[PDB]
Amino acid sequence: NRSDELRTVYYNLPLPEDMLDEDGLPLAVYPRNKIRTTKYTPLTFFPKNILFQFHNFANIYFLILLILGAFQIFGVTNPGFASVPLIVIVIITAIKDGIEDSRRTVLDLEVNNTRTHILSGVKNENVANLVDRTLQPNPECRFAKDYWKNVKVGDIVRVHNNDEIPADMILLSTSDVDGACYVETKNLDGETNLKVRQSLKCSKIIKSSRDITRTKFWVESEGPHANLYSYQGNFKWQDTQNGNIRNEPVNINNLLLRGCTLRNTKWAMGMVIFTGDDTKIMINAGVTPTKKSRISRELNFSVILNFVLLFILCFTAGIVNGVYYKQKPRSRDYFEFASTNGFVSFWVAVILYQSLVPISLYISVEIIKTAQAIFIYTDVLLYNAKLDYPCTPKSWNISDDLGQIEYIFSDKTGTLTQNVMEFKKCTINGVSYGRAYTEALAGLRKRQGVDVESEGRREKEEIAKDRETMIDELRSMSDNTQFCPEDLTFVSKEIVEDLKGSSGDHQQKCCEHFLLALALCHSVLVEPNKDDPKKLDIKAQSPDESALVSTARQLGYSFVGSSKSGLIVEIQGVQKEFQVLNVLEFNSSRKRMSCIIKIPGEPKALLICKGADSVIYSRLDRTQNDATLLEKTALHLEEYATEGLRTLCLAQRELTWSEYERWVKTYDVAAASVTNREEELDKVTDVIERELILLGGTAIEDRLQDGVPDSIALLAEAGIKLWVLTGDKVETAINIGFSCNVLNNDMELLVVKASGEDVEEFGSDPIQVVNNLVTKYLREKFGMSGSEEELKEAKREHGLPQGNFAVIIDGDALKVALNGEEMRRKFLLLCKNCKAVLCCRVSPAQKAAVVKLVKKTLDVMTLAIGDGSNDVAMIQSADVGVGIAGEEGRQAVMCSDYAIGQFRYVTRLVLVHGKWCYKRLAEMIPQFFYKNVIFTLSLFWYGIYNNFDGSYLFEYTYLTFYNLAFTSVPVILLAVLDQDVSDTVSMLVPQLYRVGILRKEWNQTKFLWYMLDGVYQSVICFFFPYLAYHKNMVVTENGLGLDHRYFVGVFVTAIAVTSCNFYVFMEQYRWDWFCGLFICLSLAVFYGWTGIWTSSSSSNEFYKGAARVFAQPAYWAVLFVGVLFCLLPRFTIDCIRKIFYPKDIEIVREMWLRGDFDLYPQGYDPTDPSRPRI
Amino acid sequence: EEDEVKNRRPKEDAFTQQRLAAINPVLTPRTVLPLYLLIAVVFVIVGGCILAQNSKVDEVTIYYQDCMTNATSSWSDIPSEHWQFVFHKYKTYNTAPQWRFVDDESDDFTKQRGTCQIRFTTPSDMKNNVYLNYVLEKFAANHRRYVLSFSEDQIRGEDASYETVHDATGINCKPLSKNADGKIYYPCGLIANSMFNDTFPLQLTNVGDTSNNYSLTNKGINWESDKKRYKKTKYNYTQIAPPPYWEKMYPDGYNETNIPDIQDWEEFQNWMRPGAFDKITKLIRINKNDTLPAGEYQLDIGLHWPVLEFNGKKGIYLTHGSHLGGRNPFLGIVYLIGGCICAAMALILLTFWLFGGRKIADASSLSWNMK
């Protein structure tokens, strides 16, 4: 992100001897244009993956046991059957991550092979007037097809219509005169309007390849600094007339960024400067982190606690084995024939309980995560059939986070809103025409208390009837060649009635003049379609102007043709040509576009301006007006502002010939002037429009994604607070936040700005302005003027939405609001008490910094739902990257975790899938750490007898077939196929997700309780068989000889396996035919495999365990009481804590079995615009 | 300018969508108290059965570890800290036994030699099956090196060389692999070497009416299937030698017709099964045909095993048994306690539900709909 390290790009000029050190290769090298989003580089995949795997401390412990059982010979058997499990686990993780990176590489190869045209015919010398008309051109120089990966610095690139620009290019030529290309920056910024880019002045002479092959020049450019509104270059060439070097500045407007889509333009020819990583996106992109989960870290801490227990056990074993060796007289010095002795005893007891944390922990968690990701991928309600895109996860280890997600940082381009603009309402002569049932009004009516579903369907039916009536009336009134009902966004029926003359003559005349003015003041171009010649489409610089012209052509006021001085208008069928005398273009600083036409009648002039509401209301005449249309129009606009409709205003005025003569005189004074002629045109534009007569206003709704106002409601009910890290500007963001029910009508909008209207009171350096604004907003409404006394107490609240305000920050105010530490804490403490924190004009780095601020400070789980190449940084640095997929966003879906079809799927990827996965892992981890304590503890409890000499109580084949076959599959099934409540009741009652917010399911006290239960269980599992043997040790129903330590081992293993499986089944929330089947199958596996191993050849010491143990009534008499006494405490505690102190889930399940949620279907989804009333 | 040119839906199943057939249970006092009551009744009934069965088993345990010292050459009683009679018919029939010692000066093993004669009376019968085992308290046979000390090739009768006996896997006889002369012991390891050596009689010599003595048999005391692993020796009669503690049983070595066939030697197979815990009770005499009537009986035990040198103990244990092995009331006690605990827990839950219960399913008892 450094602006230094400049560069120089030549064309048709060999580099001087200063850059090439006699090898023909310049010292400077430029990175390849290949985009690389893979997590692990294909050259360093194995070392990075092995280091990432060995981050976990259990892997280091396994490696330590390996290297200390291999070097220390004659302590264990051959180590060839101890390294294989660890190596297999590591290679399994390696193959899994390699498959993930292969998927990402497939995506990168699909992205990199896009077609582009590169100048072929002249070799490149970089990596391996203007036109000299004297020399003949080159007939082989053309624009040949090529890919993006082979676009080197200095290659002339031609971009066709609707073609994505490969890399940063210096504009050289365009089909249009003056070279005014239009680019769609919807990926690099929030601007929905097409940005205009001018080419170079001297480079306009060339028009084809035959002219550029004779061009020779060089561009000295600054280093890539990752900024979207700044660039400094120097174009330089040599004149063909005389001998001299000519220089020309190159600003940002002559730059074609990577993610920019060349739209509404035939072809743009330019020269590439930055490539690959040097582009303005790949620097604001990031480094595609590994994205570790959250439960993994607490898992490492739990592994450390298990290490502590193992060390305690081994210490108390090595003490007693070493105190017993110093006691006389023992039976060892007769028949059996202290530093190093105690040391070898300790390191024998270490290998004894070497499985207090088994090798199957980091291979069970990985299997569970992959299975949960696959079950996410194969969900039918997360499939968007509009483009055949299921919810494909790209980071498989991030699956339990979605159950702990608390903050959601949305976008506003392809995430909250679609890319359509529909004209909805208008105000003509103080009369409001237009019908619409906005989902904001639906949420408002729901909050009032009235019915929404039935009433909503009724209202929609009425709108449909009014629409068909309007279509019939407009088709019966006249015939228009451009008319089409599918593009008729307007629906009102009173408009056509008052346009045909059902409300007098003046009203009809005013409506006609307004509809004509809508098709006059615009820079819209008309292009005949490719397939249908009669269907002439409107190519405009902005979508709102396109919507205005479309709803004008619908009402019988079509605008066609762009003549020299004039434009054709088909009014109801009759074609008339006007005369656009002047067109004052819509500037970003003017916010109003004006047209001065010559209307006959000497004739008169007509000035029609279209602009914002307040901007045009300022340039009005409160004296010569209706004085009744102004109040009505203001009320209607204030009404439309509360419905997400970005309203405009239209004002016309008549002029005589002397006024227009005076105006063109001062214009010719100002137009052909020098020394900053801009201010002159601004003031003449201001003085011509100092007075105007408002003749109507408009209203264009920016349609959101389906079911967004209800998905937001579900998420806010679950407790998931959401911020809107918007793009383009402020007013668009405000009306959108009004559209989706984020901004209410009574919420005060705390504006945090730098050079606004409330900054004159604190007029100083912007830092002090922002500080004073934040402090005054943290003082009167909610007095918390402080940093470490309120933030430290608010961090231990887990997040509860409250405050009833909203906050709007700009780009510069944000850049200042998170540059200092105290400012960071103050800004964050402010936003934490707000309801609807927004943002405006935020660069990628700034939104990434906001996400990092919310993540690091006030540690929570953030979500980064968003589409666009500018949203990549915040997606990567948010631990959950949900990139909206489609045929538009092909860079924020790659460098992300999940790629859902549209935003309305988040409230299912997070509310039912995420909660499920989080609860499943939070129940699996303690179960897994408890099912191993109950086993190795028995090996220890056999130590207080035998005096800790190191004799295995179980056979050498039960230590490797207990953590592998007897009890692993039930735990995997509890973690893959468990459900708190069905998805219908999950999305019906989202408040249960609050449990995942407070971190109330996976805490260390739960793990300690489970380990204590394992200790008690193991005590019982060992001391019931012993107490059976404790009196006379002859319990076999025929004498005949029991009591081999392997038989007691079978007793203990049976009790422990049955207790562990029934424990897994007790804590499971639902009992289905799969988990119960596999639990019974695991029990049968234990029994039948004992039966197969004992009754076999290579079972030397055993050889009859099954026939000699399972056939006695004492075995079952011990097994039943063992299972009952291991399950009775936990079951009683559950039955009391689910009767005396029931949590939320218990009450939800009780009322679910009572019959509260027994009307809704199986695949219920409240975020669906097509669900019936169920 | 010539450059002017031109089915993934997830399979809706019952398993892919995680909508498998299931039952979602809840622990309501309508489905908890019946379970507790059923479990309690079942466990109390089973425990009553087990205790009624255990209150009938009769046993006789007599420790004789100090017969070579504390006993005399006349019929003298045994101290009260050496014998225990448990007879359910007569629960107060002490009638202490009478033991005597008859020293044999032939053996030069002063530690333990001679013969102990024990006369014990039984006032009841033992139906159709009588077991006589030897108890060895304070003998540690479950240590790390002691237990792994043998060879399963010599147990299987193979002619295992010195390498297969010494350089084997983690289960091998390391200390006693080879003697001084260079001949690998046939029974190797500290288990076979340290075998129990007291010679028990083949009958219970009667006292009352000597015309009918009660007989026993050393055949059928170990599992029959165990004869599928203990095979006959296949050694060349010149490369083996008895273990260092077996030198008094084979003072001349291993000649032609003295090599013991461990297959039909069920006591040796009984000893190659190292006991798990401290006490070691191994069956040595079995009677399957005749009932043992009342009266006095006499045992002639040949004391060849030194036990008092580590303050250990040993003795005889005579019993009929039961379906749950020897007399051990732990199972019945645990069943009774489990049943009583389940019943008390059911009663406590009933009290808490009828005195301090809650609503069935309320919309105001949740966490958010209450504050």
Ligand SMILES: *[C@@H]1O[C@H](CO)[C@@H](O[C@@H]2O[C@H](CO)[C@@H](O[C@H]3O[C@H](CO)[C@@H](O)[C@H](O)[C@@H]3O)[C@H](O)[C@H]2NC(C)=O)[C@H](O)[C@H]1NC(C)=O
């Ligand atoms: C039953 O097995 C017994 C194993 O404990 C065994 O006792 C052992 O007898 C041998 C003699 O054969 C002793 O060996 C030592 O004896 C001589 C003379 O006393 C010593 O000078 C030597 O050092 C030699 O090692 C063992 O010490 C002894 N073991 C114990 C623990 O006392 C019995 O002999 C066996 N029974 C029969 C009938 O032989």
Ligand SMILES: *[C@@H]1O[C@H](CO)[C@@H](O[C@@]2(O)O[C@H](CO)[C@@H](O)[C@H](O)[C@H]2NC(C)=O)[C@H](O)[C@H]1NC(C)=O
């Ligand atoms: C082999 O060595 C045997 C000694 O273990 C011997 O057995 C007897 O006969 O040895 C003693 C000599 O009479 C006697 O006192 C033992 O009681 C006998 N033992 C048994 C088990 O009968 C064999 O006679 C010897 N055989 C040969 C062929 O030398």
Ligand SMILES: *[C@@H]1O[C@H](CO)[C@@H](O[C@@H]2O[C@H](CO)[C@@H](O)[C@H](O)[C@H]2NC(C)=O)[C@H](O)[C@H]1NC(C)=O
């Ligand atoms: C049953 O056992 C008794 C007790 O040993 C036998 O009576 C004596 O047995 C010993 C040897 O066992 C002889 O030396 C005595 O001479 C026997 N005494 C008498 C009076 O006979 C008894 O003979 C045995 N009965 C049978 C049928 O074998």
Ligand SMILES: *[C@@H]1O[C@H](CO)[C@@H](O[C@@H]2O[C@H](CO)[C@@H](O)[C@H](O)[C@H]2NC(C)=O)[C@H](O)[C@H]1NC(C)=O
């Ligand atoms: C119980 O009866 C069985 C069946 O008769 C006895 O088994 C046989 O006993 C005789 C002794 O006279 C042996 O010769 C046979 O070899 C035995 N048959 C076998 C081993 O298959 C058994 O000995 C009797 N036991 C008692 C204690 O009376």
Ligand SMILES: CC(C)CCC[C@@H](C)[C@H]1CC[C@H]2[C@@H]3CC=C4C[C@@H](O)CC[C@]4(C)[C@H]3CC[C@]12C
């Ligand atoms: C790296 C560390 C964990 C290795 C283990 C070091 C400790 C736990 C081991 C190594 C040396 C061992 C000690 C060696 C000597 C004795 C003296 C003996 O009378 C009691 C046991 C005692 C006190 C041992 C206790 C355990 C011991 C202190």
Ligand SMILES: CC(C)CCC[C@@H](C)[C@H]1CC[C@H]2[C@@H]3CC=C4C[C@@H](O)CC[C@]4(C)[C@H]3CC[C@]12C
């Ligand atoms: C009976 C005499 C001779 C030996 C004493 C051994 C017993 C009583 C002592 C020695 C080591 C002690 C153990 C040391 C460590 C632990 C692990 C802990 O999680 C539970 C307590 C427990 C299990 C202690 C229980 C009592 C204990 C087992």
Ligand SMILES: CC(C)CCC[C@@H](C)[C@H]1CC[C@H]2[C@@H]3CC=C4C[C@@H](O)CC[C@]4(C)[C@H]3CC[C@]12C
């Ligand atoms: C030779 C005869 C005496 C052996 C009898 C052994 C009997 C007591 C043992 C062996 C097989 C055992 C059964 C094996 C299977 C089960 C099914 C289980 O759901 C309930 C216990 C039950 C029913 C066991 C009851 C006790 C049982 C019947």
Ligand SMILES: CC(C)CCC[C@@H](C)[C@H]1CC[C@H]2[C@@H]3CC=C4C[C@@H](O)CC[C@]4(C)[C@H]3CC[C@]12C
């Ligand atoms: C929110 C949670 C932590 C509140 C605590 C609820 C639990 C842990 C408390 C509240 C009531 C308590 C129970 C009250 C009565 C009994 C019956 C007694 O014979 C055994 C203890 C036992 C079973 C107590 C165990 C702990 C208990 C269940």
Ligand SMILES: CC(C)CCC[C@@H](C)[C@H]1CC[C@H]2[C@@H]3CC=C4C[C@@H](O)CC[C@]4(C)[C@H]3CC[C@]12C
């Ligand atoms: C829940 C706790 C407080 C009380 C549990 C009740 C248990 C421990 C008590 C109540 C009745 C008692 C039993 C009463 C009768 C006998 C018969 C006797 O020959 C052996 C002891 C035995 C079998 C007692 C064992 C302990 C016992 C079962």
Ligand SMILES: *[C@@H]1O[C@H](CO)[C@@H](O)[C@H](O)[C@H]1NC(C)=O
């Ligand atoms: C045998 O032990 C008993 C038990 O204390 C004792 O009274 C008696 O004196 C002992 N006999 C001899 C000979 O030591």
Ligand code: BEF
């Ligand atoms: F294109 Be955006 F609003 F980050």
